[PDB]
Design a protein around this ligand. Structure first.
Ligand code: HEM
Ligand code: HEM
Ligand SMILES: CN(C)CCc1cc(F)c(F)c(CCc2cccc(N)n2)c1
Ligand SMILES: CN(C)CCc1cc(F)c(F)c(CCc2cccc(N)n2)c1
Ligand SMILES: C[C@H](O)[C@H](O)[C@H]1CNc2nc(N)[nH]c(=O)c2N1
Ligand SMILES: C[C@H](O)[C@H](O)[C@H]1CNc2nc(N)[nH]c(=O)c2N1
Ligand SMILES: [Zn+2]
Lengths: 417, 411
């Protein structure tokens, strides 16, 4: 690899110089002859790291941590190295200190190349839930997380971290992909009620005993697995689920569509890797960018898919695509979503503000850290791409650790007791 | 190994085998992806014959005569020619096959469903800038066709020693001038200020308006470039108006009908065609999103949103997004009303998905650059947004080359 790589912004002419890529640790999926940059998941859950694999991964993280606190090579550094090395020898694993857990979680977010919101990465509240033993305890921790992060609409980013993987047969998992999502119900006639993306998970919940109200916006129950046991269902207390009815500043009829959305985006299916340790249950939450709701959730064809109905109430020419009736309604839907969150004082960021902040963050990271891995395909918003600054920004993508990773869906790997 | 690409809206999976045939690099490694970099960083006899043989082989494979007497004889003919001249000349049929396949292989082009319908004009007998001018005028007239646009390419002599290059100095055959103003601002197209200044330096008398068609600056056989005015009756233009906003016409906006790239290099079988202007028809967003609304181009969003009386005090009103959609409605409406070929990004991306299905079936894959294929507005309501794509480099191909004013030794 070359020692310096340059990225250019084609709107501003600013050129940045990347040296951080030299620390990349895992594969991207690309090769010298093919680029897999638009593949969503480019390449068993119970083959766990051996002692020999774990030693160097732990040292690399411990070294990175002591370098970050300006104590590299110190007595405390060498003693921590020695202590970790003994633990891996006698127990095949080790335990992070609280300071290291917090450092690791913040840097997994800092390293998340697909996240446009990383200007906030150092302001993450970390809840240590490694003492948890049961699904009931996981439920308690998650409710506390939801309440803290929601903060009556003044949302605060947060992560709750459950015990790390041991042999792979005692994993903690949140089976929900997000803490708060709406059910989807397949009808005998082939139509779908609610959110079609959640039809499979809704069916699992019903089979586990959930009684479905069968409405358009039913919050799904939590399905929580502690210590590899069978998962257990819990209803989130509805007062903890902040929701926003969607209305439009100009169209009085928009409220008559009956749309609403929840305030808290909380991803619960990712795996947190710190120092070769694997935290398979690590729900984290921020605040929404408006397009995640307005463009994807509402206007994806396989989601709520409301463009047609809004276009009809806007009385648009829907016969030919070149009228841009879809584009026109899409803007109005996203105007309504931003207006509704701001009116109810629920934190939200529009795609112009978020991408402008990301460019400033990226520039600061290039100066102070030597780079900032970024996935252009994910960072550019799903509407109005070129009128945001990130469209014109060349980006380098590479995988640093600590990191968030995908993992298999737990219903596909779980051994039912 | 076979690679799978999935559409996450339709769940269709396609299996790519065609990437196995590529040998040129992408810029990525196993550790760093460079998929959003715009440009990731003369041939001898020794390099030339394997490249020629590879191209002759795929040509005769394409016409189902691989290993034939014709194939074997062509290989021998090419081998002798590289020996005695350090180069070789393509047959007419090879030139046409190579230009069409350079288009077919252009991973950044959403228009490739049309690839085999390309009119190829052989200009390899040209020797002077006056001849280049003639050939380019014939191309423009043919491609424009009174608004019923036809895809075409004109191919000038190949590179020899690098000292006698043919070059069109214009980046596109038809473009508008840009002028740096005393008070600092820019009149016309800001993207062309430098090229405009070179034409002025070479004697072009600028009208100093907002939509002045630039002259052609033509370099033949490595000589100094010469200026030519494209005859105005050949330059088809569209005044932009809006189907509902009657004030839109008062903005005084226009564009030209013919998108004609003239600064790329065409590589076929090891040969380099440094002058190869090619042209198609516009996708609406090329004009309405990039040319008009890029902050570094005509940059008209503020003006339009003003006439729409939008609240511009805060980004979250999405006033930019509202004005952008109206501008792109106007462009499509205007070309359609004047019966000038244009495609909207919904129709174009749908066609590209169908093209991909075609290529995976008959060819085993289709190289495609998601970063460029997804339109600059309304991305996820077009089907390509949800389509995984593999990007890899096949030859024949179009390549970028340095601007001639950074290389030319002026005589
Ligand atoms: C604080 C405000 C935040 C904003 C505005 C934000 C914004 C976004 C957006 C728009 C995406 C793309 C989502 C999609 O299209 O599915 C994303 C992805 C991501 N975010 Fe952030 N995020 C925030 C907080 C966080 C936090 C607190 C974490 C972790 C501690 C995080 C980690 C990630 C990761 C790992 C991804 C990639 C997800 C994937 O590949 O599925 N983000 N973010
Ligand atoms: C016939 C209608 C065509 C349409 C609608 C179309 C559409 C497009 C668009 C929208 C782009 C992106 C360019 C940009 O954003 O600046 C592009 C790229 C490209 N087009 Fe096509 N195109 C067409 C015909 C052609 C033809 C005839 C050729 C050559 C024979 C061609 C070769 C290319 C190449 C090489 C690129 C990539 C340029 C680069 O790498 O920068 N296209 N096309
Ligand atoms: C398929 N994809 C459109 C949906 C995936 C998806 C569904 C959700 F419910 C959801 F909250 C997130 C959130 C991603 C995220 C995390 C943190 C902050 C933020 N702003 N965003 C992502
Ligand atoms: C980033 N930018 C400086 C490059 C601009 C650029 C460079 C190229 F080589 C190129 F082929 C095209 C294609 C534009 C085009 C061609 C034909 C039809 C059409 N509708 N459009 C555009
Ligand atoms: C095929 C493509 O990779 C896929 O549709 C991606 C594109 N970019 C994205 N970008 C974001 N932020 N979120 C997504 O889900 C996707 N989906
Ligand atoms: C940095 C980035 O690669 C650059 O802005 C690209 C993004 N995608 C694009 N896509 C198209 N079709 N045309 C472009 O000029 C660009 N510019
Ligand atoms: Zn890549």
């Amino acid at each position: 690899c070359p020692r310096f790589l340059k990225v250019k912004n084609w709107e501003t002419e600013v050129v940045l110089t990347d040296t951080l890529h030299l620390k990349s640790t895992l594969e991207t999926g690309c090769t010298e002859y093919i680029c897999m940059g638009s593949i969503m998941h480019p390449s068993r859950p119970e083959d766990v790291a051996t002692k020999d694999q774990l030693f160097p991964l732990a040292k690399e993280f411990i070294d990175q941590y002591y370098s970050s606190i300006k104590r590299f090579g110190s007595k405390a550094h060498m003693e921590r190295l020695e202590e970790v090395n003994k633990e891996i020898d006698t127990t095949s694993t080790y335990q992070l200190k609280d300071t290291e857990l917090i450092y690791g979680a913040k840097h997994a977010w800092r390293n998340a190349s697909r996240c446009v919101g990383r200007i906030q990465w150092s302001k993450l509240q970390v809840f240590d839930a490694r003492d948890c033993t049961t699904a009931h305890g996981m439920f308690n921790y998650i409710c506390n997380h939801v309440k803290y992060a929601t903060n009556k609409g003044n949302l605060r980013s947060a992560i709750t971290i459950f015990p790390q993987r041991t042999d792979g047969k005692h994993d903690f998992r949140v089976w929900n992909s997000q803490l708060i999502r709406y059910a989807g119900y397949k009808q005998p006639d082939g139509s779908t009620l609610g959110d079609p993306a959640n039809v499979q998970f809704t069916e699992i919940c019903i089979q586990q005993g959930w009684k479905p109200p069968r409405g358009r916006f039913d919050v799904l129950p939590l399905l929580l697995q502690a210590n590899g046991n069978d998962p257990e269902l819990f209803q989130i207390p509805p007062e903890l689920v902040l929701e926003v009815p969607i209305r439009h500043p100009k169209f009085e009829w928009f409220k008559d569509l009956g749309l609403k959305w929840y305030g808290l985006p909380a991803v619960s299916n990712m795996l947190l890797e710190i120092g070769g340790l694997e935290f398979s249950a690590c729900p984290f939450s921020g605040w929404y960018m408006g397009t995640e709701i307005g463009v994807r959730d509402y206007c994806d064809n396989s989601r709520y898919n409301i463009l047609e109905e809004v276009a009809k109430k806007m009385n648009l020419d829907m016969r030919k695509t070149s009228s841009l009736w879809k584009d026109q309604a899409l803007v109005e839907i996203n105007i309504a979503v931003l207006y509704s969150f701001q009116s109810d004082k629920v934190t939200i960021v529009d795609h112009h503000s978020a991408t402008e902040s990301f460019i400033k963050h990226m520039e600061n990271e290039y100066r102070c850290r030597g780079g900032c891995p970024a996935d252009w395909v994910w960072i550019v918003p799903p509407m109005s791409g070129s009128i945001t600054p990130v469209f014109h920004q060349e980006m380098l993508n590479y995988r640093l650790t600590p990191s968030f990773e995908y993992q298999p869906d737990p219903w596909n790997t779980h051994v039912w007791k």
